[PDB]
Design a protein around this nucleic acid. Structure first.
Lengths: 54, 49, 96, 56, 48, 93, 96, 48, 94, 339, 145, 48, 48
RNA sequence: AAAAAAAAAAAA
């Protein structure tokens, strides 16, 4: 259990990707928001990436 | 006031004055109304203010 | 030449003063009663008369006057297309 | 092809269209009694004279 | 005259609300020397 | 001066404050800025800086839609613009 | 002979104007509340004149609203004693 | 409605202070009471 | 013990006197018979079983179809769309 | 292994009951109808709703006799006394009011619930009323002195239902902590705890002639035998939050489901002879389909239901139905029935 | 009266104050707060009765936050639609949001009738009522457009 | 009774998404703007 | 032909409420000039 | 035919 906790914290300590958060709990909440809302909001993310059409 | 068509109003104002002033008045009635987080577009009826 | 003697529109309120000969009044009441028939006279309830004036002043409310006032209201309401505007009996006072 | 205004628009069907023909639908929004009329009438005496119960 | 005054016991009857009824028609009454309020108190069931 | 032309720095601070605060709180967003009112920040967001605005050259079918809608609704651009899919100023221009 | 009176809606309008005066932000300062009462009373009387003097309900409303303004002034002093506030306290001009 | 204004190599002091204030306000999370409680916990640990 | 501070009030209970119903029991078949008899009486009561001046006007007969309000009262279970709320908002917002 | 009975008499064959049909729908309430109480002479009934009014309706005509105000939150309980001219209301405003029906006025208050009150029962022979609420407590109150003579504690959730009977167990409290408690009224002690339900127990009822009761939680109705609380049987097949339960003098269990569902069961056998779904008043949402309260009249011939589309629905059993038109589709199945 | 009052005074003096444990009534200043409490509990109860046996029942106050969000969307006439929310939970939220809306509109109507009658001298009550009818009129105006 | 057998379909069918509040941030989180507009139903309106 | 947002508020007379519109000052100046010009020119040409 | 405390002035 301690080894799994340490490994999860170490894998959560990596800054791979775009940053949006400001705190650690903010980072975890934004990761959860991703894990639920990509399949409904990927089109909006595309619209934000392009800087044009909805 | 509530039941004024803006196209018909534009036609009648075009009857009585220059079309630029009529178009300005009709476009000025067609504006966005906002109160706090509530917002819509007035497209039917008259803005009395 | 016309029954409508006086007319005034104050922004959105109108006052119209009509004068009827007996034949014109009879024709108008006949047309109103054959358009919206009422054989038991439910017209006394709903008609308007000022309670602020004294007992003698609010004199009487008979058949002919009430039906003539409602006929005038119905005829003037028939001239306004209700998609533009209309006149409601709640917002209306008629005196004969 | 008729024109339906905003103030006489129906967004929902009627009660008879929803409940059927064999269902009685009542819309009761005013009471049949005043608040001063009791639901259970008290046992009322109504003495209008002075009468001795037993013979004196 | 000389007696106390109180709140109205029944705040219901008021002639302005009642319209032109047949029972209390204004000129079906044969007015004479006027009835005073002490007469209304002395015979409360005849004059009220 | 309260107003003026919009800069890229002001635009990015507006986007960051929208990120941190949302769209129903414009006084805080204007308080990050210095020369813009809450109404001016809201107008800049609603007319330009929203990325649900189509910011490329118009397609042809958009042009027939705009011309037909300007034929049926003379000078009601705030009404035409939701139907076309652009803003009122973009449709007018 | 046109007999004139003030309509009941306008008596209620004046009453609502005094209620709005009594609910206003500066309605705890005695000079401000007196100035607002003076403006409302001047507006009412200089508009409705001889029709206003012949309406009993309007005069009752004026009496009650003036009593309410004076009662606000008295409540601002934590008293309601009638001998404590003679008419010279209210109706003396602002110069004195 | 106009697109933007391009930046400069030499920024003025107003953009510098506006960006600094945006950075300072973009990371604030706590209120007065939470900050006071954290400071009081630090002071209590120091006193202990 | 208890911790309440009620002063005595209504210290006698009222009981259903004769004529007030309540504590008098019948069979449920009799109750069904009385219920069906009263229901049948109410339903039978419901069914009843024991120069011309207005020639230059542009628009004519525009008020036809207005008096038809009130054929049957329709309760709508949407408060913002009921007739009561529309009357309220037309009365109070001008 | 615990032995079973192989006699094939453990399953009673269901008696035939006619199906039920909609008769009436009474509008006028501006909240969800959550209370219902038929007076002992079967002339009028009492509905309490989310518009914090109590409306008295004539049972034969469905015609609004009276409206009573005085609560400020949703009325949850109501009881017309068979021995006194009293009506008893409880609400979500922590108030337990006693109305004198000879004056139509609140004459007593039973104060002491710390939260909103959900239930209220009159003891059939004693001069006692019983309330339960969101504070996990069944208050037992004396009518005359307004004294809280018992505090029934032991539940860890909202006491949602409660029945009073003339023999021990005199109080039965179902709670949202999924337990049912059988209470001796004389001592204020728990005689027994039933933990068979997995979810919050929302409905209870007692049989008029048998010494048995029934409890109901979502997806499950259980019939139990007094005074030991021995599990008698399951009523199965109503996969919904069950808010209510109504057995008749002719052995009818009525379960109303919060999604708008209805089940009519034969009491002795556990057979579901009818499965309905109510319909919403026009203007309602799909989510507003739900039977929130129910009762039978004293005759048992009418089912009164108060529903979350703010309606009152009267249901009659079908007089043109015979055992041939609606045959019983029950067969003595030979299944282990894993318990 | 005074002997009961002085007995209560000496009781607080010699055996202390029973401050905690008594049920406070729902006065006017508490009404809305009490409503919220009851409504939340009711919603929470329904959630515990709709969860299947075995589901992770820890993050269920998330549904109460969704209910707060839906009420805020109702007050602003913004259509509330969370993608991926389960249908029974959405039904519970819509049902209780409409109950809260019915209570809110009834209170607004009652306060407007009191203000017209002249029976209210509270200023915050009047400003609250103006805000509520402003929101109701804007909802009606959006529906009209 | 013995527990009901839960599939993965049920465990994913009773998953509640986190509330993307567009009014409240009690912990001052910088939410992506993509998540802010997911619950806004104005994007699901047919302009016909 | 495209204008700023107009704020909407309610004025309360304790018997009715009425809308009050808040227009941008630059557009208010243009509208006031147009209003005065239109009223004067309709007075000159006997429109009413 | 003659009506007169609190909010609200903040934990060695």
């Amino acid at each position: 259990s301690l080894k799994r906790r340490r490994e999860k914290l170490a894998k959560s300590g990596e800054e791979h990707g775009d940053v949006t958060y400001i705190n650690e709990k903010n980072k975890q909440f934004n990761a959860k928001l991703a894990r639920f809302y990509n399949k409904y909001t990927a089109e909006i993310r595309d619209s934000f990436e392009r800087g044009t059409m909805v | 006031y509530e039941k004024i068509e803006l196209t018909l109003l534009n036609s009648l104002l075009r009857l009585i004055m220059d079309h630029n002033l009529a178009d300005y008045i009709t476009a000025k009635n067609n504006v966005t109304l906002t109160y706090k987080d509530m917002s819509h577009v007035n497209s039917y009826g008259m803005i009395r203010g | 030449r016309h029954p409508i003697r006086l007319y005034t529109r104050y922004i959105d309120k109108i006052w119209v003063f009509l004068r009827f000969t007996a034949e014109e009044s009879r024709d108008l009441i006949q047309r109103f009663l054959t358009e919206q028939p009422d054989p038991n006279f439910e017209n006394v309830i709903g008609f308007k008369s000022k309670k602020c004036w004294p007992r003698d002043s609010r004199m009487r409310l008979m058949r002919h006057d009430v039906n003539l006032g409602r006929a005038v209201f119905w005829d003037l309401k028939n001239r306004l297309p209700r998609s533009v505007t209309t006149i409601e009996w709640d917002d209306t006072f008629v005196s004969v | 092809n008729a024109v339906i205004l905003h103030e006489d628009k129906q967004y929902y069907p009627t009660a008879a269209q929803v409940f059927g023909e064999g269902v009685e639908t009542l819309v009761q929004e005013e009471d049949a009694q005043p608040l001063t009329q009791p639901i259970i009438a008290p046992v009322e005496q109504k003495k209008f004279s002075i009468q001795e119960a037993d013979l004196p | 005259p000389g007696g106390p005054r109180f709140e109205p016991l029944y705040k219901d009857i008021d002639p302005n609300d009642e319209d032109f009824g047949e029972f209390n028609a204004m000129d079906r009454i044969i007015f004479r020397n006027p009835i005073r309020t002490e007469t209304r108190v002395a015979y409360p069931y005849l004059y009220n | 001066v309260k107003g003026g032309v919009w800069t890229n720095i002001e635009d990015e601070i507006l986007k960051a404050a929208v990120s941190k605060y949302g769209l129903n709180q414009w006084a805080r967003v204007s308080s990050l800025l210095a020369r813009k009112t809450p109404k001016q920040c809201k107008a800049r967001w609603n007319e330009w800086l929203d990325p649900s605005i189509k910011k490329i050259e118009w397609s042809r079918e958009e042009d027939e839609k705009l011309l037909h809608l300007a034929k049926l609704m003379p000078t009601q651009w705030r009404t035409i613009a939701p139907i076309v899919g652009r803003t009122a100023n973009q449709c007018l221009e | 002979h046109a007999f004139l009176q003030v309509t009941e809606e306008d008596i209620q309008k004046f009453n609502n104007r005094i209620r709005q005066i009594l609910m206003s932000s500066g309605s705890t300062t005695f000079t401000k509340i007196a100035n607002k009462w003076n403006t409302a009373l001047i507006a009412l009387f200089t508009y409705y004149r001889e029709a206003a003097v012949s309406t009993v309900n309007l005069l009752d409303t004026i009496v009650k609203c003036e009593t309410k303004i004076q009662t606000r002034v008295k409540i601002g002093l934590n008293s309601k004693m009638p001998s404590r506030f003679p008419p010279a306290v209210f109706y003396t001009p602002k110069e004195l | 409605t106009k697109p933007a204004r391009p930046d400069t190599i030499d920024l003025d002091e107003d953009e510098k202070e506006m960006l600094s204030e945006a950075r300072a306000r973009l990371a604030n999370t706590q209120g007065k009471k939470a900050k006071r409680k954290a400071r009081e916990r630090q002071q209590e640990e120091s006193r202990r | 013990a208890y911790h309440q501070r009620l002063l005595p009030a209504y210290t006698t209970l009222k009981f259903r006197q004769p004529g007030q119903g309540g504590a008098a029991d019948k069979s449920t078949r009799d109750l069904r018979a009385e219920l069906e008899a009263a229901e049948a009486a109410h339903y039978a009561k419901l069914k009843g079983a024991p120069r011309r001046w207005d020639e230059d006007v542009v628009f004519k007969n525009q008020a036809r179809g207005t008096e038809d309000k009130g054929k049957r009262k329709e309760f709508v279970n949407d408060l913002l769309r009921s007739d009561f709320h529309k009357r309220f908002m037309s009365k109070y917002v001008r | 292994l615990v032995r079973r009975s192989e006699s094939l008499l453990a399953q009673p064959r269901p008696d035939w009951h006619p199906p039920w049909k909609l008769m009436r729908v009474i509008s006028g309430h501006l909240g969800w109808v959550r209370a219902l109480a038929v007076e002992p002479n079967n002339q009028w009934f009492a509905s309490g709703a989310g518009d914090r009014t109590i409306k008295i309706w004539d049972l034969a005509s469905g015609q609004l006799r009276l409206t009573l105000t005085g609560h400020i939150s949703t009325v949850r309980g109501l009881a017309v006394s068979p021995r006194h001219p009293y009506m008893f209301s409880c609400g979500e405003d922590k108030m337990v009011k006693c109305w004198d029906l000879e004056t139509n006025k609140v004459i007593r208050h039973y104060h002491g619930h710390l939260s909103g009150v959900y239930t209220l029962k009159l003891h059939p022979t004693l001069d006692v009323l019983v309330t339960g609420g969101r504070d996990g407590v069944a208050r037992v109150w004396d009518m005359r002195t307004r004294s809280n003579v018992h505090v029934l504690s032991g539940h860890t959730g909202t006491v949602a239902d409660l029945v009073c009977q003339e023999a021990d167990p005199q109080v039965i409290t179902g709670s949202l902590d999924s337990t049912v408690r059988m209470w001796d009224l004389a001592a204020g002690k728990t005689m027994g705890v039933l933990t068979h339900h997995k979810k919050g127990v929302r409905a209870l009822v007692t049989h008029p002639t048998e010494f048995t009761f029934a409890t109901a939680s979502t997806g499950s109705i259980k019939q139990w035998k007094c005074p030991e609380g021995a599990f008698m049987q399951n009523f199965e097949g109503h996969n919904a939050i069950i808010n209510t339960l109504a057995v008749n003098d002719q052995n009818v269990l009525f379960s109303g489901g919060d999604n708008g569902s209805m089940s009519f069961w034969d009491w002795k056998s556990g057979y579901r002879f009818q499965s309905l779904d109510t319909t919403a008043q026009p203007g309602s949402l799909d989510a507003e389909l739900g039977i929130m309260s129910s009762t039978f009249d004293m005759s048992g011939a009418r089912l009164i239901t108060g529903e979350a589309d703010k309606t009152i629905k009267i249901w009659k059993e079908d007089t043109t139905a015979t055992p041939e038109t609606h045959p019983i589709e029950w067969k003595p199945s030979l299944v282990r029935r894993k318990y | 009266l005074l002997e009961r009052w002085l007995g209560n005074l000496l009781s607080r003096q010699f055996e202390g104050r029973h401050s905690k444990g008594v049920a406070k009534t729902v006065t006017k200043q508490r009404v809305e707060s009490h409503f919220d409490l009851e409504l939340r509990a009711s919603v929470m109860a329904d959630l515990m009765d709709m969860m299947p046996e075995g589901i992770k029942q820890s993050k269920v106050n998330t549904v109460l936050q969704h209910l707060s969000e839906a009420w805020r969307c109702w007050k602003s006439n913004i259509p509330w639609k969370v993608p991926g929310l389960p249908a029974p939970i959405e039904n519970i939220i819509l049902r209780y949001v409409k109950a809260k809306a019915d209570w809110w509109i009834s209170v607004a109507h009652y306060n407007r009738e009191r203000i017209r009658r002249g029976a209210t001298v509270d200023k915050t009550v009047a400003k609250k009522n103006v805000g509520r009818l402003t929101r109701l009129w804007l909802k009606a105006e959006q529906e009209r457009q | 009774s013995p527990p009901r057998k839960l599939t993965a379909e049920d465990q994913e069918a009773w998953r509640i998404p986190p509330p993307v509040s567009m009014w409240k941030n009690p912990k001052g989180f910088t939410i992506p703007l993509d998540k802010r507009l997911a619950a806004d139903g104005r994007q699901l309106q047919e302009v016909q | 032909r495209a204008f700023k947002e107009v704020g909407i508020d309610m004025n309360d007379n304790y018997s009715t409420i009425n809308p009050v519109y808040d227009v941008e000052p630059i557009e208010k100046i243009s509208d006031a000039y147009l209003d005065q010009y239109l009223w004067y020119q309709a007075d000159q040409r006997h429109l009413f």
